[PDB]
């Protein structure tokens with residue numbers, strides 16, 4: 001399974017700053033503006049309780065600290081509980097948390113206790129990175145390539161289909177590809193018969209998944225995938241506009257979706 005390491009989260013404030021500038025360049029909107037477009041919501045210092053969780057692989061170094069910073073960055077009044085797990089959840093609620101933010105190895109959720117809304121990181125991440133890609137100001141095309149049609153990728157593709165884009169899809173697992181084509185109506189992408197895209201969305205845990213043949217100059221590559229979907233070489237060569245950030249954008253999508 002594809003879990004963060006502590007090194008992925010180093011200087012999360014800078015990673016967020018850089019991602020937010022890239023998002024502004026690409027779409028004319030900052031991350032808050034994207035979330036406002038997606039969900040119509042804005043932050044008003046809602047209290048967010050962040051609960052460390054020890055199950056499975058356990059507490060990931062820098063994870064709760066990064067969420068603490070991300071939440072503050074978007075204007076939430078956040079805190080991290082002293083205790084983990086159920087004791088931590090009790091602490092969070094007792095200290096007045098309106099939104100609970102917590103994750104085990106399989107599920108990262110946000111639960112707004114005031115209105116009952118609950119978000120899962122996987123669809124929220126897919127949706128927001130697909131939204132960003134979709135809003136590329138200089139795209140001059142409704143064609144989009146989605147690489148990776150799993151838990152993050154499938155909802156991203158679904159979002160793009162709802163937005164009336166012409167969605168091409170590829171997954172290395174043939175069964176996943178088939179699932180997407182027959183449930184979403186996407187066009188299966190044929191790697192042996194590529195075409196160029198100005199808009200690309202990638203959601204795999206693998207490097208170098210985007211072939212050169214698919215790139216156009218200045219195309220947007222919006223990717224929650226870790227590590228990076230393209231080499232530095234190809235990024236520089238085609239002046240690719242990369243939106244890639246390990247936790248904060250997806251977390252913002254969760255939070256603004258439950259407001």
Ligand SMILES: NC(=O)C1=CN([C@@H]2O[C@H](COP(=O)(O)OP(=O)(O)OC[C@H]3O[C@@H](n4cnc5c(N)ncnc54)[C@H](O)[C@@H]3O)[C@@H](O)[C@H]2O)C=CC1
Pocket residue numbers: 002003004121122125147148149150151152153170171172173176203204205206209223224225226227245246247248249250251
């Ligand atoms: N940046 C962020 O905020 C977040 C990042 N992620 C990351 O997103 C990635 C995807 O997560 P999930 O969708 O949950 O994983 P998943 O395992 O559900 O789906 C990944 C898909 O990519 C496909 N794939 C793998 N190698 C490929 C290749 N070379 N070419 C085409 N397809 C390939 C797999 O067949 C699989 O269907 C992971 O690396 C995960 O860590 C996940 C959540 C939030």
Ligand SMILES: C[C@H]1CC=N[C@@H]1C(=O)NCCCC[C@H](N)C(=O)O
Pocket residue numbers: 002003004051052053054055058059060061063064103104105106108121246247
């Ligand atoms: C990109 C992230 C967000 C969702 N999946 C990836 C992930 O690493 N999930 C596992 C998070 C586990 C956190 C850990 N239980 C903790 O509380 O420190």
Ligand SMILES: [Mg+2]
Pocket residue numbers: 224245246247248249250251
């Ligand atoms: Mg992110």
Ligand code: NA
Pocket residue numbers: 202203204205206207208209225226227228229
């Ligand atoms: Na990747």
